[PDB]
Write a protein that binds this ligand. Structure first.
Ligand SMILES: CCCCCCCCCCCCCCCCCC(=O)OC[C@H](COP(=O)([O-])OCC(O)COP(=O)([O-])OC[C@@H](COC(=O)CCCCCCCCCCCCCCCCC)OC(=O)CCCCCCCCCCCCCCCCC)OC(=O)CCCCCCCCCCCCCCCCC
Ligand SMILES: CCCCCCCCCCCCCCCCCC(=O)OC[C@H](COP(=O)([O-])OCC(O)COP(=O)([O-])OC[C@@H](COC(=O)CCCCCCCCCCCCCCCCC)OC(=O)CCCCCCCCCCCCCCCCC)OC(=O)CCCCCCCCCCCCCCCCC
Ligand SMILES: CCCCCCCCCCCCCCCCCC(=O)OC[C@H](COP(=O)([O-])OCC(O)COP(=O)([O-])OC[C@@H](COC(=O)CCCCCCCCCCCCCCCCC)OC(=O)CCCCCCCCCCCCCCCCC)OC(=O)CCCCCCCCCCCCCCCCC
Ligand SMILES: CCCCCCCCCCCCCCCCCC(=O)OC[C@H](COP(=O)([O-])OCC(O)COP(=O)([O-])OC[C@@H](COC(=O)CCCCCCCCCCCCCCCCC)OC(=O)CCCCCCCCCCCCCCCCC)OC(=O)CCCCCCCCCCCCCCCCC
Ligand SMILES: CCCCCCCCCCCCCCCCCC(=O)OC[C@H](COP(=O)([O-])OCC[N+](C)(C)C)OC(=O)CCCCCCCCCCCCCCCCC
Ligand SMILES: CCCCCCCCCCCCCCCCCC(=O)OC[C@H](COP(=O)([O-])OCC[N+](C)(C)C)OC(=O)CCCCCCCCCCCCCCCCC
Ligand SMILES: COC1=C(OC)C(=O)C(C/C=C(\C)CC/C=C(\C)CC/C=C(\C)CC/C=C(\C)CC/C=C(\C)CC/C=C(/C)CC/C=C(\C)CCC=C(C)C)=C(C)C1=O
Ligand SMILES: Nc1ncnc2c1ncn2[C@@H]1O[C@H](COP(=O)(O)OP(=O)(O)OP(=O)(O)O)[C@@H](O)[C@H]1O
Ligand SMILES: [Mg+2]
Lengths: 108, 140, 60, 58, 54, 49, 54, 67, 99, 231, 256, 96, 41, 77
């Protein structure tokens, strides 16, 4: 549960959002943190990642970072549909609702 | 420079003092003789045999990596991994087997190392002073 | 979105157990004759294909 | 990059080069003038086979 | 304001591969074989003379 | 002559009769990416690279 | 004639020349890239004078 | 224009009347080559240039033609 | 220098001319390239390619005598594995539909 | 300098500069269901997702050995994309490749990841070596700055800022200090600085046509026997 | 349920479908997060490539046969073919013809076990084309915005109710089959644009088509139901109803 | 202890076949022959690679940067390159 | 710079502790000899 | 010419000197001696004619972030 950060070992922390407002703030912070993102302040809930300098391969790095922060196991069949900020928000809700009803994580 | 050369130095440390300090500069012939047998870093001291091994070791090893890195004959039988039609799959393990057989290249070099030589005719000639004998000498 | 990039021109065949189900076995081959009797019908009924039957009878 | 071609067994010269200019210079007078296809690996085999109502898959 | 600039401490080192060296490189290429070949045949035997030996 | 006829028949012709390649494709996502990727580089091409 | 081996010399003799002219061939490729680069830097020389023009 | 103007000009590229009757070298030099002379590489260049003039630098005609 | 030394020129372009024929779509060039080397000492006897093997044994044509057998066995197996690849339908791949 | 004179250099039996579908006798032909009994093919429609998962693995498995170096992760990402964008931007019509370029590139990338999973890929070792050589030079600067000492890079920056003032202080007729002038001032300083260093000989020939190697010692002979070590 | 499954965490429903070009298997299974150099083991142990092929190719293949072993325990595989193999094995020393007739029923048994233990693969491209033709589904779902949350598809065990499917009460068909060859499952879908979710429940059975002896479609959806759920709207779509589909077509009853 | 270890015997191999002593000679020659053939094929890809990466570029097309060219530019630049960049920045972006 | 060793103007003690590129290769080979103790053993 | 002399004097005709020094050493150098495989401070020559790409703005920030005025430019852009 530890990772190297600038040569130093640090304990990783997992997040539990369980709230629509906290999800929107997380995704925005996530996309704004990506070094390829443009117009970080012009980013909103209805922003297309292609309009901010992101391609299909950048949507993978974003999902890869979602698995780091939330502990999800995202399949490759779900990544190529994450092309908007609104998509990351609804996917996170679908995963939390699925675990609350089915009692298990979605198929990886 | 290598450790064996450094070992010579500690043993020849006093000898170097006599040649390089005293003889190498005294005068006349004793100088020419001491400056000729000077002790120090070897001029053209490289060992080509060592280098010949390093080169041939590297070239033959690059061949081992190719010959040993082959797709499996067993995995191609199911038609489920990476290989549907492989009409020469039965040649997959020929080069690997040929390289592994190369480990006995020097262990079994010459006739004497492949059998019990005293039961062979060439042994009689060696014990007779490398001298020609009739072919039926092992029976008489 | 893998179905978006899937080409429907591969639907020309319906491959199942190394056999194309869209094969007119009623007009070509050992199965075309409809005057076949109880034994010949029960034989194809088991294998469903002349290719599998011929292959097995090759060794038999 | 040369080690990458070797360790992946891409030992067909000019397969991963978009313009294998060295391949065109060697084939200026070759029979069946052709250059290797892009990213062709010496181990891949896309051969297929089918059985039809006619012989030889025809 | 620019003269006030300072520097951050960078990382001490990157990862050091325990099975790759300069004399025993892990991966293969004709470049290292060429290096060993010329060590073997040695440098170009340049003649300092005014005429060839033969 | 017999040298050519041997390999031209045992390998070249033999495999041309009993093996083939399909023309139908199952996936064509390179064609549509190259078009979108070319629009992303429209300005650099305008500079004549 | 069986000119296969000659075809291999003609190509090598041509590459021998392309290598000898590497510096010139590449320098000409950059003369156009530098032209593109110099053209984009003209927009900054215009803005630096706006404060004086104003 | 002047370059193409002279290429098309019949006078500039015209064999003399007796040219047909003259002895003609029917090789470009690839049959017997000097391999060990210090101008070796210079010789190959003249072979390549002779082969190119024959085909207007479209060497596909040479590949298709008879050797 | 690969552009002045005719020894590396001949070997480099020769190998490139051999591997480029993978576009003929025979089979994996990584598989049958080793058999080509053996077949070369069968028909290369006409060109004396076996010369460097004269001191390696008491038979100058040893490698050529083995290669002709190798060439025969693996070519004899090429049709056998091809039928194994067709499967139980292999007879339909050859003759087609029955009558 | 020198241009290829053969106009047919890029001609192939399949067309001009065709390296996607070379012409061969056994050409692809269509298949008809009503007439096809059985078929053996390895093609499928799984390359798109394999292209995605392959990128995620190569990125995540190489980051294991970056030690949290954020600048290296970002630099590596830019390099990883350059390897996956090859089919999207190449002259080669990767969409018209013989038997499916999508399956071809995916299978080719998988062979790269196999080496990455073992941490034996040359790009990995090249990255570790290049980075260690970079951090050693950044730490040398840090140690000199903490000591209040000036770095070799700042001495030039300061020496160049003053050289510009000297040039524009006399350039009064004109007032357009082009980037070309700024450049040749620095180069005049770099050549002088580089020549000052005791560097190994890079150019074959020095001021004279003669080579600058240790082997280019010809007659006349003026060196005596070599002397031994001093005690 | 997916039969062929390794310790690899990603792409479970594609593990048997994807044909990797690896020479050997990767050192470590696909990482779910960035790890440390000491988390993995450099220079893996000796004979590691042979170990992986056993625990990543052989073992999950045997777990498939064991998971679906209830489909091969028929009187034809258990008694007929082995008994036929023993009758000729007593004469295998007399001639070669007995060795062949003694091994054929065993290769035949393996082929039926091989084909029957595979995971039931339907033509999913026919399915997605079917749902994307319905306007009530396309109102909330699109291929460029849909993602899979769960997938389950497995054969139904034993003979079914002998009133809805009297076909399987055939002593001749039972001698060859102990199962029905029918499958039942569901699909948990989600749309990242509309936020909608639906459970696509479906039942399948093999049917005959256009021919006499050959099956037309081994997995024909005779019941296809979708319970769509959105922000505050619940819809129930019936693309294929079984009460109306079973009146037109009947199962195929595989033999051999 | 089993009789399978009898295969390790070469003193008395002349009593059974006397074939091993001759076949391995061929195997050693066959390995030597392949070593010369394969080593030439795999090694001689460098002249093509060395040439194309240095002469295959054209001005009517875009040359895209590779992995190595990315790391070398960002993590292997020398001091003069660092100076020239900041020298241009300070003069034009800061001091105009 | 100028303190670099010269084979002519060299001290005895310095030659004994030279440790040039030749030794650097050997030390890399020794690193493999030691790591192979368990495999050979 | 093709008649350069005897076989023994063949290595004589190669040298071409840039000075008037006599006698002239005959040996014509083939290659440059490279005894030590030294890592060159020199930057790689592959970075020659590569068009503008993402590496240009990523490196610009790294150099701009080294200045106070540059940190403002990057953050605002
Ligand atoms: C008790 C001790 C404690 C034990 C407990 C601990 C247990 C832990 C075990 C740990 C690991 C064990 C290792 C094995 C497990 C592997 C499992 C796995 O998943 O690996 C997959 C693994 C994955 O592939 P890979 O990692 O990519 O590469 C693997 C290899 O590197 C290369 O892969 P490849 O596929 O490319 O290699 C192919 C090669 C593999 O090498 C072999 O296995 C040799 C095969 C020889 C036998 C071939 C049988 C042919 C069929 C004949 C039918 C009759 C049989 C009768 C037998 C009677 C015997 C007297 O076979 C071939 O060469 C195929 C061509 C065959 C020749 C062509 C002609 C054939 C027909 C000839 C007919 C002649 C008949 C004439 C007259 C007939 C008249 C009737 O593939 C493997 O199979 C691994 C094999 C590793 C080598 C094992 C053997 C080591 C040598 C030991 C010394 C010899 C002892 C055994 C001798 C056996 C009899 C000769
Ligand atoms: C003698 C030495 C013996 C040595 C024995 C050695 C030990 C042997 C043991 C092992 C036996 C082999 C094992 C075989 C089974 C293996 C599996 C297999 O292969 O599949 C079965 C396999 C299937 O046959 P198929 O060719 O695929 O079927 C063709 C169509 O698919 C069928 O199409 P379809 O099903 O739709 O309809 C068929 C038929 C419709 O058929 C029917 O519907 C009739 C159905 C009647 C059923 C009867 C039910 C009986 C129930 C029991 C009784 C009631 C219970 C009462 C209980 C009372 C209790 C006391 O329609 C036709 O019209 C057929 C064409 C007309 C007949 C052509 C016959 C040509 C014969 C030429 C020779 C003529 C000889 C005449 C003079 C002979 C005087 C001796 O059976 C055979 O292969 C039979 C053997 C064929 C060999 C032919 C080569 C020999 C040529 C004939 C001999 C010529 C004479 C030579 C010497 C003469 C010296 C005088
Ligand atoms: C009990 C007492 C017994 C012991 C007494 C102790 C003393 C014994 C004698 C030891 C002598 C050591 C010092 C002299 C060695 C080198 C002499 C020499 O001419 O080399 C200078 C010559 C160039 O010197 P340079 O004047 O400064 O010109 C520099 C240019 O770069 C050169 O290139 P370039 O193209 O610019 O200029 C032309 C080039 C023209 O030359 C070349 O470029 C190539 C010359 C052909 C090389 C040989 C190819 C043979 C293929 C292999 C077959 C035989 C292998 C030997 C073993 C076979 C199994 C027994 O060189 C020349 O200027 C004129 C060439 C003069 C004749 C060359 C041929 C000499 C024979 C070499 C092979 C000897 C073995 C076969 C003899 C029969 C064996 C029974 O270098 C070579 O010839 C290299 C070839 C290997 C030479 C060493 C071979 C072993 C010792 C040979 C002694 C020769 C006399 C005995 C055999 C003659 C029988 C007809
Ligand atoms: C000295 C000898 C020299 C000879 C050298 C020859 C050496 C040859 C080496 C070649 C390699 C052989 C190894 C074979 C590997 C087989 C592995 C395997 O089992 O995988 C299955 C595999 C089939 O899988 P698949 O085709 O991929 O797909 C299957 C479909 O999914 C299936 O679709 P489906 O489900 O719709 O099909 C239904 C079913 C249909 O099946 C049927 O047709 C039914 C048959 C009738 C059954 C009996 C019905 C009884 C009904 C009773 C009714 C009772 C009613 C009760 C009512 C109840 C009342 C209450 O089909 C099957 O499931 C059976 C297919 C598998 C049959 C395998 C037969 C193998 C026989 C080999 C025997 C001899 C082996 C000796 C080995 C010795 C080694 C030392 O078998 C094959 O692929 C066979 C290919 C073999 C071709 C080899 C050809 C090589 C050339 C040989 C002759 C050359 C002569 C010229 C010589 C020139 C000199 C060189
Ligand atoms: C030297 C020591 C080592 C030697 C090793 C062997 C090196 C061999 C060198 C390479 C030889 C390559 C021969 C390829 C010939 C292809 C010519 C061609 O493209 O046809 C064009 C021809 C001609 O078109 P063209 O345009 O290319 O040439 C025109 C020729 N003129 C100018 C005269 C008009 O057209 C065809 O397409 C006909 C195709 C017929 C192909 C018959 C040859 C088949 C043999 C190859 C298969 C062998 C597989 C062996 C595997 C064995 C495994 C055990
Ligand atoms: C009575 C004496 C016994 C005689 C000796 C018999 C030996 C039997 C065992 C060795 C042979 C095994 C078959 C090897 C050929 C198949 C290769 C393979 O594994 O592919 C797997 C394949 C995997 O599929 P795949 O290889 O096609 O690839 C799948 C798709 N990809 C590539 C994408 C992943 O699966 C199968 O073939 C099904 C399982 C094979 C069953 C093999 C028999 C196992 C027997 C187990 C015995 C258990 C009881 C006794 C032992 C108890 C232990 C304590
Ligand atoms: C494992 O995979 C493989 C390789 O790795 C990739 C290969 O490189 C290769 C290629 C192999 C090579 C290039 C090596 C080839 C070697 C050959 C042909 C023989 C070499 C022969 C020599 C170098 C001559 C040696 C002469 C002698 C030994 C005779 C005189 C005796 C001497 C010199 C030693 C004295 C004898 C003793 C028993 C005392 C031993 C002394 C010591 C151990 C002291 C050591 C001292 C120190 C300081 C280490 C193969 C085949 C391979 O299979
Ligand atoms: N039209 C076709 N032409 C040639 N070969 C085919 C064709 N269709 C399938 N094949 C081969 O048969 C195999 C099985 O086909 P199948 O339709 O079952 O794959 P699938 O992934 O399950 O498709 P789907 O996603 O629609 O369910 C394929 O992997 C392919 O190798
Ligand atoms: Mg399916």
């Amino acid at each position: 549960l530890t990772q190297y950060v600038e040569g130093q070992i640090v304990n990783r922390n997992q997040l539990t959002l369980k709230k629509q407002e906290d999800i929107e703030q997380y995704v925005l912070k996530l996309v704004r943190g990506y070094f390829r993102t443009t117009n970080k302040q012009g980013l909103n809930i209805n922003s297309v990642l292609q309009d901010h300098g992101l391609d299909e391969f950048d949507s993978i790095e974003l999902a890869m970072q979602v698995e780091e922060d939330l502990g999800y196991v995202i399949s490759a069949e779900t990544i190529p549909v994450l092309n908007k900020v609104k998509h990351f928000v609804n996917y996170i809700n679908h995963v939390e609702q699925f675990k609350a009803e089915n009692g298990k994580a979605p198929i990886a | 420079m290598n450790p064996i050369q450094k070992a010579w130095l500690k043993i020849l440390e006093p000898v170097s003092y006599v040649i390089n300090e005293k003889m190498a500069k005294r005068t006349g012939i004793i100088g020419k003789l001491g400056r000729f047998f000077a002790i120090g870093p070897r001029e053209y001291g490289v060992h080509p045999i060592n280098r010949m091994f390093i080169f041939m070791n590297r070239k033959y090893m690059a061949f081992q990596a190719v010959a040993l890195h082959r797709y499996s004959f067993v995995k191609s039988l199911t038609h489920n991994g990476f290989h549907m039609l492989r009409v020469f799959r039965h040649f997959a393990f020929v080069l690997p087997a040929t390289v592994l057989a190369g480990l006995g290249l020097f262990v079994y070099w010459g006739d004497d190392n492949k059998c019990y030589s005293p039961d062979r005719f060439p042994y009689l000639k060696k014990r007779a002073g490398d001298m020609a004998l009739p072919l039926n000498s092992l029976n008489q | 979105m893998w179905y978006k990039y899937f080409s429907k021109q591969s639907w020309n065949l319906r491959v199942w157990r190394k056999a194309n189900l869209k094969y007119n076995q009623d007009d070509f081959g050992m199965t075309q004759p409809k005057y076949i009797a109880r034994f010949g019908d029960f034989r194809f009924r088991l294998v469903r294909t002349e290719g599998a039957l011929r292959g097995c009878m090759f060794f038999v | 990059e040369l080690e990458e071609l070797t360790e992946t067994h891409n030992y067909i010269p000019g397969a991963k080069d978009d313009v294998n200019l060295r391949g065109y210079l060697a084939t200026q007078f070759a029979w069946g003038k052709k250059v290797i296809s892009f990213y062709r690996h010496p181990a891949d085999d896309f051969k297929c086979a089918k059985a039809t109502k006619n012989m030889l898959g025809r | 304001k620019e003269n006030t600039g300072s520097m951050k401490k960078p990382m001490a080192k990157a990862y050091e591969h325990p099975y790759n060296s300069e004399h025993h490189p892990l991966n293969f290429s004709a470049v290292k074989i060429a290096e060993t070949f010329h060590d073997f045949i040695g440098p170009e035997q340049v003649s300092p003379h005014y005429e060839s030996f033969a | 002559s017999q040298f050519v006829a041997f390999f031209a028949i045992v390998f070249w012709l033999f495999l041309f009769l009993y093996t083939f390649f399909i023309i139908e494709k199952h996936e064509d996502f390179f064609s549509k990416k190259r078009e979108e990727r070319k629009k992303k580089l429209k300005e650099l091409w305008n500079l004549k690279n | 004639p069986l000119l296969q081996r000659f075809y291999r010399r003609a190509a090598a003799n041509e590459i021998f020349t392309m290598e000898a002219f590497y510096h010139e061939n590449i320098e000409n490729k950059l003369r156009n890239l530098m032209r593109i680069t110099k053209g984009q830097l003209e927009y900054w020389d215009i803005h630096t004078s706006y404060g004086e023009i104003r | 224009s002047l370059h193409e103007k002279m290429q098309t000009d019949y006078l500039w590229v015209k064999d003399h009347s007796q040219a047909d009757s003259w002895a003609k070298a029917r090789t470009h030099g690839y049959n017997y080559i000097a391999h060990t002379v210090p101008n070796k590489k210079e010789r190959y260049e003249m072979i390549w240039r002779s082969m190119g003039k024959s085909t207007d630098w479209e060497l596909e005609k040479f590949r298709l033609g008879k050797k | 220098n690969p552009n002045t030394e005719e020894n590396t020129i001949d070997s480099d372009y020769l190998a490139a001319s051999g591997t480029v024929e993978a576009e003929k779509e025979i089979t994996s060039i990584d598989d049958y390239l080793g058999l080509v080397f053996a077949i070369a000492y069968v028909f290369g006897v006409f060109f004396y390619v076996h010369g460097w093997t004269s001191m390696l044994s008491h038979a100058v044509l040893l490698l050529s005598c083995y290669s002709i057998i190798i060439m025969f066995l693996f070519i004899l197996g090429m049709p056998t594995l091809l039928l194994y690849d067709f499967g139980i339908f292999f007879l339909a791949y050859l003759k087609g539909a029955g009558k | 300098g020198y241009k290829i004179r053969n106009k047919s250099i890029f001609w192939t039996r399949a067309g001009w500069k065709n390296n996607w579908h070379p012409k061969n006798f056994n050409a692809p032909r269509p298949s008809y269901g009503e007439f096809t009994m059985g078929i053996r093919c390895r093609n499928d429609h799984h390359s798109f997702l394999r292209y995605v998962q392959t990128y995620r693995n190569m990125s995540r498995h190489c980051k294991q050995y970056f030690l949290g170096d954020k600048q290296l992760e970002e630099t590596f990402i830019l390099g990883l994309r350059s390897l996956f964008l090859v089919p999207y931007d190449s002259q080669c019509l990767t969409d018209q490749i013989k038997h499916g370029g999508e399956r071809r590139f995916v299978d080719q990338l998988d062979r790269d990841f196999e080496l990455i999973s073992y941490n034996t890929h040359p790009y990995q070792l090249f990255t570790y070596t290049v980075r260690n050589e970079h951090l050693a030079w950044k730490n040398e600067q840090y140690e000199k700055i903490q000591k209040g000492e000036k770095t070799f890079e700042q001495e030039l920056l300061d020496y160049l800022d003053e050289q510009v003032l000297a040039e524009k202080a006399k350039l009064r007729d004109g007032q357009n200090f082009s980037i070309e002038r700024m450049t040749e001032i620095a180069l005049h300083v770099f050549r002088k600085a580089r020549a000052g260093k005791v560097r190994p000989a890079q150019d074959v020939r020095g001021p004279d046509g003669n080579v600058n190697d240790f082997l280019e010692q010809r007659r006349p002979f003026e060196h005596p026997n070599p002397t031994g070590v001093t005690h | 349920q997916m039969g062929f499954s390794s310790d690899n965490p990603y792409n479970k429903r594609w593990e048997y479908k994807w044909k990797h070009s690896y020479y050997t298997y990767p050192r470590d299974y696909e990482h779910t997060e960035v790890r440390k150099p000491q988390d993995s083991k450099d220079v893996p142990p000796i004979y590691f490539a042979y170990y992986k092929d056993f625990v990543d190719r052989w073992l999950p293949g045997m777990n498939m046969w064991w998971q679906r072993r209830h489909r091969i325990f028929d009187k034809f595989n258990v008694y007929f073919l082995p008994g036929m193999s023993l009758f000729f094995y007593q004469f295998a020393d007399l001639a070669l013809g007995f060795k062949i007739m003694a091994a054929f029923p065993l290769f035949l048994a393996y082929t039926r076990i091989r084909d029957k233990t595979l995971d039931p693969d339907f033509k999913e491209t026919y399915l997605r084309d079917m749902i994307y033709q319905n306007p009530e589904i396309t109102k909330y779902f699109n291929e460029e915005t849909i993602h899979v949350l769960d997938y389950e598809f497995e054969y139904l065990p034993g003979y079914l109710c002998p009133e809805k499917f009297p076909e399987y009460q055939n002593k001749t068909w039972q001698f060859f089959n102990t199962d029905t060859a029918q499958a039942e499952g569901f699909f948990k879908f989600g749309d990242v644009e509309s936020g909608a979710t639906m459970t696509l429940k479906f039942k399948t059975m093999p049917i005959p088509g256009k021919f006499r002896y050959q099956v037309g479609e081994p997995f024909y959806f005779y019941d296809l139901r979708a319970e769509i759920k959105c922000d505050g709207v619940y819809k129930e779509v019936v693309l294929v109803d079984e009460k109306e589909s079973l009146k037109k077509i009947r199962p195929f009853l595989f033999l051999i | 202890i089993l009789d399978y270890l009898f295969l390790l015997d070469l003193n008395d191999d002349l009593t059974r076949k006397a074939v091993f002593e001759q076949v391995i000679i061929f195997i050693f020659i066959y390995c030597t022959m392949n070593f010369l053939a394969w080593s030439t094929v795999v090694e001689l890809i460098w002249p093509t690679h060395f040439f194309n990466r240095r002469h295959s570029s054209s001005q009517e097309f875009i040359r895209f940067r590779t992995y190595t060219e990315v790391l070398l530019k960002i993590s292997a630049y020398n001091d003069f390159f660092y100076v020239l960049n900041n020298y241009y920045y300070n003069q034009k972006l800061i001091l105009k | 710079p100028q303190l670099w060793p010269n084979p002519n103007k060299l001290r005895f003690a310095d030659l004994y502790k030279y440790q040039g590129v030749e030794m650097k290769k050997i030390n890399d080979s020794i690193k493999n000899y030691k790591a192979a103790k368990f495999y050979i053993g | 010419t093709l008649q350069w002399g005897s076989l023994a004097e063949r290595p004589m005709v190669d040298r071409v000197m840039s000075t008037s020094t006599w006698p002239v050493p005959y040996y014509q150098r083939l290659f440059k001696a490279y005894p030590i495989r030294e890592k060159k401070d020199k930057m790689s020559l592959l970075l020659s004619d590569i068009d503008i790409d993402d590496t240009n703005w990523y490196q610009a920030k790294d150099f701009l972030r080294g200045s106070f005025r540059g940190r403002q430019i990057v953050d605002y852009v």
